[PDB]
């Protein structure tokens, strides 16, 4: 019987007929004298990819599902469908663009190491990426301080990078924080 104050980013809740992946938790301090601390959670509906927000009291009872992770390789894209394959038993995992939209801003067209899938008793839930990714800059102002400029990466993602960077350079990105880490 888990409570809301014990929930962390990465868990999946069974809440009001939906399976919700926890994306963010904001511990909000009391709004007024006598009020309680509240837990504002941001979720992603694993079936539709739609965002859901809910606020809970610390002791509210929730239901977390048991998760199973499996290492995967990106197999191929077919329009809206994205096929991955289990590196061990070669089981295919098909996601729609909606379900992995935010992960697609970081995943290069050849996939990447340390990629996992979240499952619950045979049901495919989400794609879990590693901490960092190396992506090539396609569009940026000519490389010429402590000041950053915008850069469009191969996946379409726009990020802030140092002035001297030029198009075609491969850069390291912290996925969770969307920050440049170096070449």
Numbering used by the authors: 1 to 144, 150 to 188
The authors write:
Additionally, numerous bacteria possess an EF-P paralog called EfpL (also known as YeiP) of unknown function. Here, we functionally and structurally characterize EfpL from Escherichia coli and demonstrate its role in the translational stress response. Bioinformatic analyses based on AlphaFold predictions indicate that EF-P-like proteins have a three-domain structure similar to EF-P, but they only share about 30% sequence similarity.
In the frame of this study, we solve the structure of E. coli EfpL (EfpL) and uncover its role in translation of XP(P)X-containing proteins: Through ribosome profiling, we explore the EfpL arrest motif spectrum and uncover additional sequences beyond the typical polyproline motifs that both EF-P and EfpL can resolve. The EfpL structure reveals a significantly tilted KOW domain relative to the C-terminal di-domain compared to EF-P structures, certainly enabled by the flexible hinge region between the independent moieties. However, a separate alignment of KOW and OB di-domains between E. coli EfpL and for example, the EF-P structure resolved within the E. coli ribosome from Huter et al., reveals low r.m.s.d. values. Furthermore, the model suggests EfpL could mediate specific interactions with the RNA as—unlike EF-P_K34—EfpL_R33 was found to stack between the two C-bases and make polar interactions with the phosphate-sugar backbone. Hence, based on the docking model we suggest that the prolonged β3Ωβ4 loop and its central tip R33 are capable of compensating for the lack of a modified lysine. A literature search revealed that E. coli EfpL is acylated at four different lysines (K23, K40, K51, and K57) in the KOW domain.
